[PDB]
């Protein structure tokens, strides 16, 4: 699937059903909702940054070269620009993990529909299933709800293949 | 003092006349606890203390380094460069802040990705 | 023939989000953690005006510099504002100690 769908503004991952009756864009509810739950929890958990406690820390040379100041200075300046870099990495990290998580959900749904349909359809296009037989609106729901049944439409589909075979 | 028994010495050495005076005058301080004694003894080069600030209502504050006027707006926050009344977790403005104020990061942008790659048509 | 197609979401969010592999990647939805919004005029905090020390340095206010004497019995301040490069108060020739302390 190398092309995005603008019409699927309800959820991320969706199916474009096409029957003799018509064509629509139906999002998969469980995939989108579960993914949204996981992504949101990642976001809120990443926020936890738990900076070091405010240990009321400051010193200075005290006119006697008490570099505790330049030590404590570096220590705070060195904790930042290190944690900041480290945090930039964690953002970039989580960014990719969300992106590949998305690609994985795509491929999982495509395998779901392949497993149900099997040889009752042709894999054609960028993730499109051309039904040899006619999947009714209900039948389209059954594939979506995971309740599709191969045998009922099997024989009809088989004869159609043999016609073009 | 209680602990700061700071027996000091002047030093006869400076640079050119600053504002018409070549010599220097380093000043000092000490936070003093109640019922504590401050034994000052000197026989020269000493600028003795005659007035002092009684610390009262100790409360969170800081020392802001900027040249900006006063606002007529009770804003939940102040930073050397201005104020902030939002909720985003982190800042890039300035570490020095007042009470309620997001944390400070030196990054130019920190955006977490929560959606798909936006590829229209 | 009857067909079913698979697809992901796409909107018009120009939001750019960087990754380890790529940068300036436009995503459909994103969250921002940093922010650069500041008015520029130093306002108030919780209804508590600050000790805007105008020109006189913090040392001068403490050391009682004759110029800028107006700030002596000012009531409690939520914070203290010092202009950088204090010009009016030269605090005289001298080096304060344990300063940032």
């Amino acid at each position, epitope marked *: 699937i190398e092309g995005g769908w603008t019409g699927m503004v309800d*959820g991320w991952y969706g199916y474009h059903h096409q029957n003799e009756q018509g064509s629509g864009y139906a999002a998969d509810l469980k995939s989108t909702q579960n993914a949204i739950d996981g992504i*949101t929890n990642k976001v*809120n958990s990443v926020i936890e940054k738990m900076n070091t406690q405010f240990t009321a820390v400051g010193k200075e040379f005290n006119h006697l070269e008490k570099r505790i100041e330049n030590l404590n200075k570096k220590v705070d300046d060195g904790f930042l620009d290190i944690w900041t870099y480290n945090a930039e990495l964690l953002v970039l990290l989580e960014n990719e993990r969300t992106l590949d998580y998305h690609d994985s959900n795509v491929k999982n749904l495509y395998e779901k529909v392949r497993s149900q349909l099997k040889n009752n359809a042709k894999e054609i296009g960028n993730g499109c299933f051309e039904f040899y037989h006619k999947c009714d609106n209900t039948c389209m729901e059954s594939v979506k709800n995971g309740t599709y049944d191969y045998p009922k439409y099997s024989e009809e589909a088989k004869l159609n293949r043999e016609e073009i075979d | 003092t209680s602990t700061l028994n700071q027996r000091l010495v002047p030093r006869i050495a400076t640079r050119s006349k600053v504002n018409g005076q070549s010599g220097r005058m380093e000043f000092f301080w000490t936070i003093l606890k109640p019922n504590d004694a401050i034994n000052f003894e000197s026989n020269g080069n000493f600028i003795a203390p005659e007035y002092a600030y009684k610390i009262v209502k100790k409360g969170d504050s800081t020392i802001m380094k900027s040249e900006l006027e006063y606002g007529n707006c009770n804003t939940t926050c102040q930073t050397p460069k201005g104020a902030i009344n939002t909720s*985003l977790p982190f800042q890039n403005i300035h570490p020095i802040t007042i009470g309620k104020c997001p944390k400070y990061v030196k990054s130019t942008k920190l955006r977490l990705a929560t959606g798909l790659r936006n590829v229209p048509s | 023939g009857d067909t079913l197609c698979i697809g992901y979401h796409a909107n018009n969010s120009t939001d750019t989000v960087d990754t380890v592999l790529e940068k300036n990647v436009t995503v459909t939805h994103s*969250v921002n953690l940093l922010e650069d919004k500041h008015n520029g005029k130093l306002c108030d905090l919780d209804g508590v005006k600050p000790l805007i020390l105008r020109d006189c340095s913090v040392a001068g206010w403490l050391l009682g510099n004759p110029m800028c004497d107006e700030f002596i019995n000012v009531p409690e301040w939520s914070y203290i504002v010092e202009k950088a490069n204090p010009v009016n108060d030269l605090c005289y020739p001298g080096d304060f100690n344990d300063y940032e302390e």
Partner: antibody
Framework: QVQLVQSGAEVKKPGASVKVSCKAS????????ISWVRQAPGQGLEWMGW????????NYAQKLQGRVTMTTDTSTSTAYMELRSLRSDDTAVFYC???????????????WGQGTLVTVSS | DVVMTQSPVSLPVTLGQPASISCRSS???????????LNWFQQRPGQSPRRLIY???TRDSGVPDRFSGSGSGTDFTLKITTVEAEDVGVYYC?????????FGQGTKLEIKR
């Protein structure tokens, strides 16, 4: 503008189905969703469910999942909440509120309805 | 599941005494959209609930400037200056971004003292 008209007050016996209707207008009904809230007599506010007119995405509250059935008539822009099984404890007043339809988008109970109280005792 | 704890349930006030109502969540309340979601509500007794602050920092069209939603982390607050008389009533936190939507308990106001 703001017009979330709830149904009339309803009185039933335990174990009978109840049907509340919230008819909406005076404001664009662009698939905007509708959620239903319950306030026990002089007690807390408990969210019961949400339905997206854009889709059929119901989210009945775990506590009450089997009994509760929610519907939408886009043509009349009317939502419906139906509690199949009734209880004396369920006796309360029910409230409606608009919600955003897309799960991707957040929620907005911008408009609230007229409280349909429902009494359930033998 | 989400737990919205409302700290000051009982809140008597005197006219013109900015008072605050604190809502504390069990988990962070940010969402994929990007914005937090704690639209405060007010149900003036005898009337149906009303909305105040959209998200965490957005006053509603017909809301007095007195009402102000605040807070960034799990602990959010709502402070109304010049507490007036229609201001009295019950208030609830907003449902968490989690689909478990949680209004939490209520906070009641008094006219004077």
């Amino acid at each position: 503008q703001v017009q979330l008209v709830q149904s009339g007050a309803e009185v039933k016996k335990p174990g009978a189905s109840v049907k509340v209707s919230c008819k909406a207008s005076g404001y664009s009904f662009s698939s905007y969703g509708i959620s239903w809230v319950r306030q026990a007599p002089g007690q807390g506010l408990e969210w019961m469910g949400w339905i997206s007119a854009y889709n059929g995405n119901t989210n009945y509250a775990q506590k009450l999942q089997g009994r509760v059935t929610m519907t939408t008539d886009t043509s009349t822009s009317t939502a419906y909440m139906e509690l199949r099984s009734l209880r004396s404890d369920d006796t309360a007043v029910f409230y409606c509120a608009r919600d955003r339809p897309h799960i991707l988008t957040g929620f907005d109970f911008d408009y609230w309805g007229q409280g349909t109280l429902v009494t359930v005792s033998s | 599941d989400v737990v919205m704890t409302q700290s000051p349930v009982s809140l008597p006030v005197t006219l013109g005494q900015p008072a605050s109502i604190s809502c504390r969540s069990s988990q962070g309340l940010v969402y994929i959209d990007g914005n937090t979601y704690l639209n405060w509500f007010q149900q003036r007794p005898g009337q149906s609930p009303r909305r105040l602050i959209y998200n965490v920092f957005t006053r509603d069209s017909g809301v007095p400037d007195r009402f102000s939603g605040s807070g960034s982390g799990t602990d959010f607050t709502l402070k109304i200056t010049t507490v007036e008389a229609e201001d009295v009533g019950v208030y609830y936190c907003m449902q968490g971004t989690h689909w478990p939507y949680t209004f939490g308990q209520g906070t009641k106001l008094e006219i004077k003292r």
